[PDB]
Amino acid sequence: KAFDLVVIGAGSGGLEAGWNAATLYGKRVAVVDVQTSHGPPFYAALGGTCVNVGCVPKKLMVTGAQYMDHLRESAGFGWEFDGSSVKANWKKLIAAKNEAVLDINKSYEGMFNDTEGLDFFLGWGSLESKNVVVVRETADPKSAVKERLQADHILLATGSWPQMPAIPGIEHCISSNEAFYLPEPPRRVLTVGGGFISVEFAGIFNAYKPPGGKVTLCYRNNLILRGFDETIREEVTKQLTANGIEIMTNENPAKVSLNTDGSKHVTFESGKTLDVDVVMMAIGRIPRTNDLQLGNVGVKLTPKGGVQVDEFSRTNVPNIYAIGDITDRLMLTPVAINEGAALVDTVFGNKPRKTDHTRVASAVFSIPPIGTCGLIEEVAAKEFEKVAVYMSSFTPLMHNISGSKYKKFVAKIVTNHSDGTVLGVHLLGDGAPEIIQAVGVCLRLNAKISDFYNTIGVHPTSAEELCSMRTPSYYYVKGEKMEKLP
Amino acid sequence: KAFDLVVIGAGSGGLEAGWNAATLYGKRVAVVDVQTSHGPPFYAALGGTCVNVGCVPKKLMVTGAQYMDHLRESAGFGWEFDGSSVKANWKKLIAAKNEAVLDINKSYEGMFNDTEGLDFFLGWGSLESKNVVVVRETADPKSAVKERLQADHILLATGSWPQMPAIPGIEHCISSNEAFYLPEPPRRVLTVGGGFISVEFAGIFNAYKPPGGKVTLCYRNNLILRGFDETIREEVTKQLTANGIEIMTNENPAKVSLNTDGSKHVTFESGKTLDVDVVMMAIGRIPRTNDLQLGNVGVKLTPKGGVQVDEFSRTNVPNIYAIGDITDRLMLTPVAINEGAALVDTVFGNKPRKTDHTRVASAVFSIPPIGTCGLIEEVAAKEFEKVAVYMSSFTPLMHNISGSKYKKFVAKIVTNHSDGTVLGVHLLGDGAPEIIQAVGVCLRLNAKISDFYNTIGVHPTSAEELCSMRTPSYYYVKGEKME
Ligand SMILES: Cc1cc2nc3c(=O)[nH]c(=O)nc-3n(C[C@H](O)[C@H](O)[C@H](O)COP(=O)(O)OP(=O)(O)OC[C@H]3O[C@@H](n4cnc5c(N)ncnc54)[C@H](O)[C@@H]3O)c2cc1C
Ligand SMILES: Cc1cc2nc3c(=O)[nH]c(=O)nc-3n(C[C@H](O)[C@H](O)[C@H](O)COP(=O)(O)OP(=O)(O)OC[C@H]3O[C@@H](n4cnc5c(N)ncnc54)[C@H](O)[C@@H]3O)c2cc1C
Ligand SMILES: CC(C)N1CCN(C(=O)c2cccs2)CC1
Ligand SMILES: CC(C)N1CCN(C(=O)c2cccs2)CC1
Ligand SMILES: [Br-]
Ligand SMILES: [Mg+2]
Ligand SMILES: [Mg+2]
Numbered sequence: 001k002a003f004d005l006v007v008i009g010a011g012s013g014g015l016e017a018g019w020n021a022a023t024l025y026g027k028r029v030a031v032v033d034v035q036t037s038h039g040p041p042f043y044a045a046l047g048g049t050c051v052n053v054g055c056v057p058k059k060l061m062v063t064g065a066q067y068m069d070h071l072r073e074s075a076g077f078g079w080e081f082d083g084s085s086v087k088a089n090w091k092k093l094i095a096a097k098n099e100a101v102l103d104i105n106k107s108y109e110g111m112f113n114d115t116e117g118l119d120f121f122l123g124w125g126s127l128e129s130k131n132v133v134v135v136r137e138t139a140d141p142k143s144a145v146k147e148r149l150q151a152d153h154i155l156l157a158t159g160s161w162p163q164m165p166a167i168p169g170i171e172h173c174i175s176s177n178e179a180f181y182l183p184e185p186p187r188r189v190l191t192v193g194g195g196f197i198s199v200e201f202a203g204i205f206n207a208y209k210p211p212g213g214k215v216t217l218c219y220r221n222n223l224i225l226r227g228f229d230e231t232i233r234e235e236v237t238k239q240l241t242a243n244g245i246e247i248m249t250n251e252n253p254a255k256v257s258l259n260t261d262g263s264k265h266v267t268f269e270s271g272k273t274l275d276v277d278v279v280m281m282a283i284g285r286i287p288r289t290n291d292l293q294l295g296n297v298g299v300k301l302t303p304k305g306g307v308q309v310d311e312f313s314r315t316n317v318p319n320i321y322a323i324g325d326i327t328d329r330l331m332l333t334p335v336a337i338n339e340g341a342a343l344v345d346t347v348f349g350n351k352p353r354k355t356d357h358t359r360v361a362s363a364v365f366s367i368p369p370i371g372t373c374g375l376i377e378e379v380a381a382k383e384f385e386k387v388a389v390y391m392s393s394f395t396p397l398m399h400n401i402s403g404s405k406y407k408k409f410v411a412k413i414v415t416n417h418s419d420g421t422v423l424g425v426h427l428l429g430d431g432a433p434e435i436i437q438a439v440g441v442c443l444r445l446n447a448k449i450s451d452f453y454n455t456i457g458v459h460p461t462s463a464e465e466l467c468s469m470r471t472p473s474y475y476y477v478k479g480e481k482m483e484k485l486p
Numbered sequence: 487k488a489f490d491l492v493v494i495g496a497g498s499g500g501l502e503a504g505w506n507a508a509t510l511y512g513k514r515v516a517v518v519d520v521q522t523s524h525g526p527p528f529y530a531a532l533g534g535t536c537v538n539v540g541c542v543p544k545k546l547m548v549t550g551a552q553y554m555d556h557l558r559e560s561a562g563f564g565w566e567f568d569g570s571s572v573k574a575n576w577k578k579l580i581a582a583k584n585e586a587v588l589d590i591n592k593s594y595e596g597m598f599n600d601t602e603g604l605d606f607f608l609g610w611g612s613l614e615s616k617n618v619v620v621v622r623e624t625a626d627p628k629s630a631v632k633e634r635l636q637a638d639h640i641l642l643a644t645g646s647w648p649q650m651p652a653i654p655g656i657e658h659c660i661s662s663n664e665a666f667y668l669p670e671p672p673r674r675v676l677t678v679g680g681g682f683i684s685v686e687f688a689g690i691f692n693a694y695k696p697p698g699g700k701v702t703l704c705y706r707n708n709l710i711l712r713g714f715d716e717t718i719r720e721e722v723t724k725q726l727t728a729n730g731i732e733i734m735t736n737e738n739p740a741k742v743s744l745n746t747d748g749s750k751h752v753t754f755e756s757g758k759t760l761d762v763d764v765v766m767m768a769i770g771r772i773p774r775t776n777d778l779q780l781g782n783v784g785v786k787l788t789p790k791g792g793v794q795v796d797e798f799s800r801t802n803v804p805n806i807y808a809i810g811d812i813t814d815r816l817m818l819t820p821v822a823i824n825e826g827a828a829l830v831d832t833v834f835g836n837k838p839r840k841t842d843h844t845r846v847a848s849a850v851f852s853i854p855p856i857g858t859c860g861l862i863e864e865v866a867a868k869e870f871e872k873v874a875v876y877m878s879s880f881t882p883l884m885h886n887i888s889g890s891k892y893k894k895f896v897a898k899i900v901t902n903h904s905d906g907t908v909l910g911v912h913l914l915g916d917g918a919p920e921i922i923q924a925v926g927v928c929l930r931l932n933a934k935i936s937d938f939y940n941t942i943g944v945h946p947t948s949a950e951e952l953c954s955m956r957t958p959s960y961y962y963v964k965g966e967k968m969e
Pocket of ligand 2: 536
């Protein structure tokens with residue numbers, strides 16, 4: 001019942017901290033989660049959101065969806081078959097995803113039993129006091145105590161949860177959680193939101209829709225994928241449109257009613273209507289702090305509801321730390337993992353290390369995908385007197401042959417033009433997520449544009465574009481866009 | 487006609503050098519090549535080997551070959567279609583490739599038309615004297631004189647040429663050159679060689695072969711792809727085999743005869759025999775110096791037949807330079823291009839620059855592909871007291887579902903374990919050529935393994951393997967491997 005470290009949430013950050021503490025520092029660790037394997041009722045489980053209802057199943061389903069483009073694109077390279085026989089079997093996809101996720105769930109169960117001092121507890125973690133976590137049977141604080149855990153150190157790693165707008169008929173809508181378990185592929189679907197989850201799902205549903213199907217993505221503002229490079233945001237919008245997805249910008253559901261056939265009558269704020277079989281809400285995720293009962297020990301939360309932390313993932317309460325999505329910063333698995341690894345190398349390895357939240361490589365598995373690291377030019381331009389933007393945008397030759405002429409590859413390098421330091425790299429096109437990883441390492445090494453252009457290209461690749469750009473396309477000078485420096 | 491620079495060979499290096507000299511340094515530039523567009527009879531042409539009968543068309547054809555895997559792999563993700571309707575139409579591939587290559591040929595044609603101080607001459611360039619290039623009708627130096635070009639400076643940029651073993655029946659075999667123009671896909675094909683061209687073409691032929699077809703690759707040595715990471719060599723061998731390619735190692739053709747139906751009867755040195763429709767020789771490429779009459783000026787060759795150069799691409803004859811494959815250093819388009827730019831900067835810019843032939847990222851467009859940059863462990867182990875290998879090898883999750891469970895991704899980082907400096911990164915699997923590019927930039931910046939594992943992964947990717955390795959898999963200490 002006594003532990004060096006108790007972790008609430010067996011997810012991306014929680015497991016990295018737990019396993020590191022046990023295996024690197026022979027520490028004694030409790031990890032709490034509400035569920036041992038994926039899906040209803042609590043969706044996230046042992047392994048966390050990414051494993052159960054996030055990156056892992058999403059990427060398998062985007063990979064499935066990509067075959068729609070490969071089957072069509074194959075014809076340009078001389079592949080011939082009965083196009084009229086082509087069917088996308090969603091049920092097969094979901095069964096294959098379910099088996100993949102379950103094997104990971106079981107892989108983590110093995111990890112806990114096999115590892116000394118690493119113990120899993122099923123149920124709901126909350127804080128009784130500074131040094132006691134209570135595991136209950138439900139998220140109700142009044143339910144039965146299964147366990148009382150003594151903790152020299154407490155890690156909050158409970159992640160996030162979909163936000164559902166409080167509109168009439170929200171109960172007819174799903175989140176990404178339910179999207180992973182739809183028994184049938186929707187013929188018509190409204191993905192609500194302009195972020196990566198709405199965009200990724202629009203692509204999935206677009207590939208698997210039955211005949212006479214239609215994917216609509218709505219976003220309340222002017223242009224999807226706020227926080228990404230502007231050129232890439234416009235381009236993804238075109239390329240999604242090109243592949244039959246309808247993008248409704250400056251539009252937002254005001255309500256949903258069931259039609260008598262079970263379908264959804266969406267009324268927009270603009271007064272427009274749309275009938276769809278599924279309304280998937282992907283408008284944001286919010287930290288899971290409620291069920292932890294943080295009032296009991298006075299852990300300070302931020303305006304937006306995320307656990308306030310310093311650079312070392314420390315709360316205002318000594319011995320109590322918080323990593324990953326509960327901190328409501330960068331909601332990425334590898335950031336959660338990095339924070340957990342750093343927190344444990346600090347507290348238990350006596351080797352203080354802080355996560356760098358700058359120059360983080362990330363991806364959108366849009367079709368085609370985004371790979372990005374560091375600052376967008378708008379952001380750079382406000383911090384630096386002189387910003388250069390290097391840009392190469394073209395339909396790769398293979399997509400001239402494939403027939404997908406709309407698949408413009410975009411490579412942008414944003415620099416501090418005063419010294420050539422690379423501030424950001426922004427890619428749209430096949431392989432962007434793979435290209436961008438080692439760019440992350442480059443930015444950590446303070447790479448300049450000349451480090452890229454003096455490296456010899458790998459030919460033929462999309463990636464060599466990054467090593468072929470010597471001359472700015474344009475600049476920002478004290479915030480002002482211009483073709484040429486004064 | 488008199489030029490600051492005459493370039494013999496309108497290829498990767500030759501065009502970089504000529505365009506740079508003309509446009510950046512304002513020099514009057516002549517460039518010579520034997521053809522304005524791709525294919526028979528001389529195969530290479532305006533644009534060079536890469537454009538016409540190398541990197542560009544081969545990448546298009548491997549992309550085509552990859553759909554064989556995508557169509558089969560689609561089923562695991564729920565895709566359904568009539569498998570028996572599936573045909574690989576080679577003729578369509580070749581026509582698509584030919585248009586793509588011809589478009590590049592035409593654009594280079596327009597570049598010469600529209601670029602003042604940059605002139606193209608059609609025919610065979612050779613040295614008459616140290617300041618005169620003669621362009622003739624044919625490779626034969628007795629053929630008719632089309633031009634005589636006065637040159638302050640002469641760049642030899644004629645590239646390389648397939649090596650053909652002098653065996654009985656060599657005339658019944660082709661090289662990569664002819665392979666790009668086969669009118670029909672061979673039912674049975676022997677690729678001879680364990681290098682990237684043999685392996686890449688074995689993949690191409692394997693996808694487009696007519697029903698009941700068979701691709702065989704033979705190699706004199708024990709394990710294909712010498713120079714590549716040994717784990718990757720063993721895995722690519724397995725993964726080719728798993729996709730129906732017959733790998734015959736320790737085998738080499740002794741001779742070829744025509745069977746009565748006109749197929750090729752192959753006699754291997756081991757006595758063994760194989761009947762194939764095509765024998766593609768991919769055993770090496772040799773510098774193209776024969777036709778240049780370098781004897782007229784005394785440019786020093788190696789016994790190989792490459793032009794000897796210093797680090798600045800200077801021959802023993804002042805004002806005569808060589809870059810690209812003709813120099814037999816690193817036979818890659820981007821190296822040729824880099825050498826060309828570096829030469830012109832040195833000579834016409836007084837900006838002294840030499841190509842770094844170390845830590846050059848390269849790829850093999852095998853199925854699945856290889857991306858590599860820097861030293862393999864065996865090499866690092868002879869030059870460094872302590873070498874660490876970080877290795878991650880596994881079937882990606884998507885290939886459990888696809889049914890291609892043989893498709894092991896391999897990521898390996900080789901370090902100087904004394905300071906953690908990355909010496910080499912070696913990748914096998916989907917994306918590897920795309921992943922390795924920015925790794926080339928890392929190695930230029932003296933990246934250490936700690937720079938990799940302190941970088942935050944992009945997830946889910948194959949590339950994040952590079953940023954998730956904390957702990958060596960094994961070591962070499964004074965050349966000896968220690969788990
Ligand atoms: C659809 C989708 C796609 C995504 N795609 C990507 C992607 O491609 N790449 C990427 O990097 N990130 C992606 N993410 C984000 C990623 O899933 C999260 O950033 C990551 O899971 C956060 O990890 P964490 O450690 O904060 O918590 P999680 O991994 O969310 O783990 C939290 C765990 O805590 C448990 N829990 C919660 N409350 C309690 C309690 N009171 N007691 C006990 N257990 C509790 C939950 O059951 C859960 O298992 C995606 C997210 C979603 C929703
Ligand atoms: C099948 C194959 C695949 C390849 N794949 C890749 C790859 O994926 N990536 C990569 O980086 N490299 C690849 N390469 C290598 C790449 O093609 C070469 O390294 C590169 O083309 C060499 O450039 P260069 O300037 O030295 O010569 P080249 O580009 O070969 O140009 C030489 C030119 O000179 C002309 N010429 C020859 N003799 C004369 C003469 N006497 N007078 C006039 N003109 C003459 C030829 O017609 C030719 O156009 C491949 C090569 C082959 C054969
Ligand atoms: C390697 C680098 C030079 N890029 C090759 C691919 N690429 C194109 O497709 C185009 C060629 C000309 C106009 S667009 C952009 C440039
Ligand atoms: C980034 C790092 C954690 N890797 C994740 C992917 N990966 C696997 O999928 C494995 C499957 C089989 C054995 S491991 C290897 C490890
Ligand atoms: Br060998
Ligand atoms: Mg245990
Ligand atoms: Mg001209």
